[PDB]
RNA sequence: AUUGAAAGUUCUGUUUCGAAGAAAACCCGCCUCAGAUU
């Protein structure tokens, strides 16, 4: 086997744990697809957050 | 350079079509700004 560790360092992306108050929401929609014939639904998750993220790089 | 090193759960879809808060009803019946002054 043969390693070469990654030059960029990435970390998650969470929305920030400041105060005692968490602003982030996490909502339910609904959609519909329209036919002629029926016989044609879907939901989606939809956020809103105040996100933060650090990284490394070493161009050396 | 760490049971570490390499990894997108991603692509495609209308909550649409139609339906008058409308008809009836007096705010109204009586009252002085009046007597004195070059």
Known sequence: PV???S???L????PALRG???P???EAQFHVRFSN???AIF???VSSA????????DED
């Open 3 to 5: 390693r070469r560790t």
């Open 50 to 57: 105040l996100y933060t993220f650090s990284f490394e790089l």
């Open 7 to 9: 030059r960029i360092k």
């Open 24 to 26: 982030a929401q996490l």
């Open 11 to 14: 970390g998650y992306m969470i």
């Open 43 to 45: 939901n989606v998750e």
């Open 37 to 39: 014939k029926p016989v």
């Open 20 to 22: 005692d108050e968490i």
